[PDB]
Amino acid sequence: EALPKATG
Amino acid sequence: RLLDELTLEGVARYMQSERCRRVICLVGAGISTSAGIPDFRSPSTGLYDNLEKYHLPYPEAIFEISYFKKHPEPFFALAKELYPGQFKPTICHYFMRLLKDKGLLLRCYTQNIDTLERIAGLEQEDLVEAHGTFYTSHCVSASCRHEYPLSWMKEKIFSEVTPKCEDCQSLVKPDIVFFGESLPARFFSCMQSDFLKVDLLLVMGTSLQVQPFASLISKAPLSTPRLLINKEKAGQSGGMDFDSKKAYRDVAWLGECDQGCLALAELLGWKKELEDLVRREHASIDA
Ligand SMILES: *CCC[n+]1cc(CCCCCCCCCCCC)n([C@H]2O[C@H](COP(=O)(O)OP(=O)(O)OC[C@H]3O[C@@H](n4cnc5c(N)ncnc54)[C@H](O)[C@@H]3O)[C@@H](O)[C@H]2O)n1
Ligand SMILES: [Zn+2]
């Protein structure tokens, strides 16, 4: 799990 | 409605009133095009219509982390290609500088990696560099993370040698949030407090198409006015309502960012301030 990622 | 006219002049009158204390700026590649750095999605001039020399599955792979870890050479080639001769912030950057100097700037959330906000004089506390920076670079091994300065990165990039870490021999990547990478924790820390107290959203030079950055426009209180300064409308479905008969707070000024910031500064009574600031700072830079 991680912090929200960069997404198109 | 807090604005008395859905126009640039109404926004200026609101900013002069005492309710408007905290302004958040959300900026993108559009506020740097007039500085020589192209944007991504504008026709012919944008980067996405200049990436056939690099043969890619999709144009965004040159900025996606898995493809970078497997094929880093296209990215560093584009890096050597686009590295500008000069780093001069635009009228829009110095408009944000003026917002800081007058105690109006709560925060600037930027998608840009060119450090031009910093060079304009916005300090770290003022900035949320949501997608990182080109300024520093790190080894991609999470157990190593050896840091390297921009000088080493420039030697390796212009020597056309793919940067490798002198400890792991692993790849060395500039501190940019590629697609598929997590945004910095500072982004989520600032977001929780900033958008409860914001009196004005100033969106400039962005197509609002990358997440979760774009969702920021809907985190403000529903009464908070929002001004878009952009060549084209953006952020329409929260969601920017410019045209509808229900519109009450969103204003779009379609044109150059620099021209809109000149116009808003004049409406505010800051025209000469902004002109002198730009001259003095571009002079100190050209030295
Ligand atoms: C999830 C993470 C996704 N991600 C990562 C990155 C960073 C990529 C960095 C690549 C650097 C390569 C080396 C370059 C070195 C340069 C020197 C140091 N990104 C980036 O992509 C997104 C772009 O979105 P955006 O909203 O910022 O830009 P668009 O091009 O889509 O839209 C621009 C917008 O502005 C209008 N416009 C252009 N020019 C204008 C002027 N002068 N005045 C007004 N309006 C103007 C266009 O019409 C359009 O609407 C970002 O997320 C960025 O970080 N993504
Ligand atoms: Zn290493």
**CATH number (domain holding residue B63):** 3.30.1600.10
Residues B97 and B139 in one domain: no
B139 and B3 in one domain? no
Contact (CB<8Å) B178/A4 = no
3-state secondary structure of B211: strand
- Ligand 1 site, residue B106, Cβ cutoff 6 A: no
Among B145, B166, B184, residue at a domain's last position:
B184
CB contact at 8 A, B196 and B116:
no
Question: Which single residue is written with the structure tokens 């116009």?
Answer: B263
Domain at B189, CATH number: 3.40.50.1220
Whether residue B71 is found in the same domain as residue B83: yes
- Experimental approach was X-ray
Cβ-based contacts of A5 with chain B (< 8 Å): 179-183
Do B260 and B199 lie in one domain? The reply is yes
For residues B261 and B236, membership in a common domain is answered with yes
Q: Which atom of ligand 1 is nearest to the CA of B213?
A: 52
Give buried/exposed letters for B109-118 (b at 16+ CB in 10 A, else e): bbbbbbbbbb
Range of the domain at B67: 34-89+131-184
Last residue of a domain, one of B184, B214, B248: B184
- B201 and B118 in a common domain: yes
Under DSSP, the state recorded for B183 is: P
B60 CB neighbours in chain A (<8 A) are 8
- Total Cβ atoms within 10 A of residue B129: 24
How close, in Å, is residue A3 to chain B by CA atoms? Answer: 6
Helices (H), chain B: 8-16, 65-70, 73-82, 91-101, 116-120, 150-158, 185-194, 257-268, 271-286
User: Which ligand 1 atom lies nearest to the CA of residue B130?
Assistant: 54
- Where among B142, B164, B184 does a domain terminate? B184
| B177 ligand 1 Cβ < 6 A | yes
Domains contained in chain B, number = 2
Indicate whether B201 and B125 sit together in one domain: yes
Known catalytic residues of B? Answer: 131
Verify that B232 and B106 share a domain, yes or no: yes
For residues B3 and B112, state if they share a domain: yes
CA closest to A3 among chain B residues: B182
Statement to judge: residues B136 and B244 lie in one domain = no
- Angstrom distance (rounded) from CA B271 to CA B91: 11
Alpha carbon of B137 to ligand 2 centroid (Å): 11
Ligand-binding annotation for B39, yes or no, is yes
Phi/psi of residue B253, nearest 5 degrees: -115, 105
Resolution reading in Å = 2.3
Cα–Cα distance for residue pair B233/B130, rounded to 1 Å: 22
Q: Find out whether the beta carbon of B37 lies less than 6 Å from any atom of ligand 1.
A: yes
CB neighbour list of residue B233: distance below 8 Å, 6 or more residues apart? B240, B242, B252, B254
CA of B134 to the centre of ligand 2 (A): 18
How many A from CA of B132 to the centre of ligand 1? 13
Q: What is the per-residue DSSP string for A1-8?
A: --SPBPB-
Is residue B217 within 8 Å of residue B223, measured between CB atoms? Answer: no
Backbone angles phi, psi at B109, to 5 degrees: -90, 120
* Shared domain check, B190 and B146: no
Q: For residues B3 and B95, state if they share a domain.
A: yes
Burial of B48 (0-12, 13-18, 19+ CB in 10 A): middle
